[PDB]
Symmetry: C3
Subunit: 255 residues, 3 copies
């Protein structure tokens, strides 16, 4: 199960039923949980923390030092949860003093060449397409779908159930449930496909749609739009999430 042609530092903590292929390099100050599969030529570096049930494909590199030139050798981690699919040449750098922990949650698919920068936060249930780049200290909420070659600027946040189209770039926040596409990036309606596929009622889908008509298509400023959403759209946790997300947006939201 553990190949003798892997290099595993004697201090690495490794759980049960872990398969490690040849030419895997595992450093000290590494924690790996149970039921993991680490394929050939993958690299698990100082500071990595890996949960249970993951598969790490060839050439992935977890835990390399930040690409941030503000990094000065401080202790930090790079972490993934459970049941993730970490594809070929995915990079997850460890954190900086700005936070200290780069964290990926559970049940994500990070397609080949995806980059997760220092102090970034990915939730659960996300799909991130080929060679998408998540810059420093970003946040991705649960259940987001991001296509390939997307550029997510530092400190941005993506809401749940968003679909971001391939090749888009953005430096504002993306509120929950929407499609974001075009250049420059833009609100492009609701992720009806994703929501239907996940079992949301047609009624809740229509409410979400109506909230975003108010927000984007009624000529109102943000405050007034959110007031009107609160007054006129049948309330539900989905609608409150839209409102709270926008109302507290650190960067502002995309157009």
């Amino acid at each position: 199960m553990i190949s003798p042609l892997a290099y595993i530092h004697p201090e690495a903590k490794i759980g049960e039923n872990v398969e490690i292929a040849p030419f895997v390099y595992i450093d000290r100050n590494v924690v790996i949980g149970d039921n993991n599969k680490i394929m050939a030529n993958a690299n698990i570096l100082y500071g990595s923390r890996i949960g249970n049930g993951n598969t790490i494909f060839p050439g992935a590199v977890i835990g390399a030092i930040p690409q941030d030139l503000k990094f000065k050798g401080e202790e930090s981690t790079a972490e993934i949860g459970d049941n993730n699919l970490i594809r070929e040449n995915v990079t997850i750098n460890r954190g900086t003093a700005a936070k200290g922990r780069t964290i990926v949650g559970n049940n994500n698919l990070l397609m080949e060449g995806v980059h997760v920068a220092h102090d970034a936060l990915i939730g659960n249930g996300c799909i991130v397409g080929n060679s998408t780049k998540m810059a420093g200290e970003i946040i991705i909420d649960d259940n987001a779908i991001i296509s390939a070659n997307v550029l997510m600027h530092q400190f941005c946040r993506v809401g749940g159930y968003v679909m971001i189209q391939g090749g888009c770039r953005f430096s504002k926040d993306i509120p929950p449930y929407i499609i974001a596409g075009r250049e420059p990036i833009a609100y492009s309606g609701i992720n009806i496909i994703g929501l239907r596929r996940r079992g949301f009622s047609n009624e809740i889908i229509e409410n979400i749609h109506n909230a975003y008509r108010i927000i984007y298509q009624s000529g109102l400023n943000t405050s007034d739009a959110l007031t009107k959403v609160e007054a006129e759209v049948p309330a539900s946790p989905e609608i409150e999430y839209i409102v709270d997300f926008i109302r507290n947006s650190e960067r502002g939201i995309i157009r």
Copy 2:
């Protein structure tokens, strides 16, 4: 020739005059032909089928399972033909039940970081630039030139002798002999450079140009344009290929 620092599963079938560098990982249920060069730290996984005369550069990964979450562990292959140049960190995933075979033909250059998704089909004589992403079940016809960072949506088809400019993205078919560029992507004239370089007569080049003036610049709908091309452009296999390609286009063609 075969390095003792490679890992090669005893069941892998390997042809003659095959050079295998250190830290290459070759699985079972692999077929490799004659006269291949597999460089250091490359990965040839379960289900790979490799022809003759190829060079596989460091960090390439052939045969990993689909990135498609519809994959359920079905048997499939990832295949390349003869005389290809498979550059650094190129990924060619094996197929899904949708087809079962990811296939690359002969005499292609796949530049570093290029991704070939499950069930994709590449023909012969193609050049695909750095980190271009070919999504599920795409088709690339012979002799195409695709630049870097191109995003080719699932189920699309690219015709022969096209040049696609760097950074473009598309979700319709690209008909043969054209330049496709800009954002949003657009017909941008004929690949005169490529056609001249390959020895096409000036007369045939002019006919191709005239067919596309009819198709794109005459205000006609697709049917009427193709009717007029058939009536007015001196017929040749090139012109019939343009017509047939558009007439049977599954997605429609780009603007």
Copy 3:
């Protein structure tokens, strides 16, 4: 310090205090200087020349043959200077007969997946973001900052102290001190942040700004603009660099 699980050709020349991790592959006709750190699964190929004080991250490939099909097996090199940070899966191909040497200077950061094509030239003090692609025979002057997923066409040149925004592409030269952004790419003002951060006087910053108002915003052709800059902007090495760079631009400059 030198891992026994590395492969190092007996002819490779390796300096003092060099750390080499497991699964590193080092060819013959390689020169490596002092105080280098080469991490796991990196590849240093025939023709590489490495200076002092660098760190080469996992999966980087230095010295592979050109991706140029005009290459016919001629001797060439791939070179880096001192104190560079060469991140995961960075590719630096060796040269062709067009020049013969791919050269990277000192004190650069090349973020993961960056490609440096045959005969390219990078100076000193540059930062090049994730998966940026530098095509054949490009030139990057000192102190440039290039974001992620940038596409730099063959034979282009980037001036010092430029900031190029993420996802941009260009096939003309970028003159010194500017921000280049949008699609299509465009002059987007001065890199005031970068210049201030590096200690340039407010007065010199204002002069640079005034030269570019003349160049881009006064309706003058290139010659007349440069004449007026020479006549009206207080002269300094910065202003002479702007003028000389544009005046001798091989491709023309971006809009």
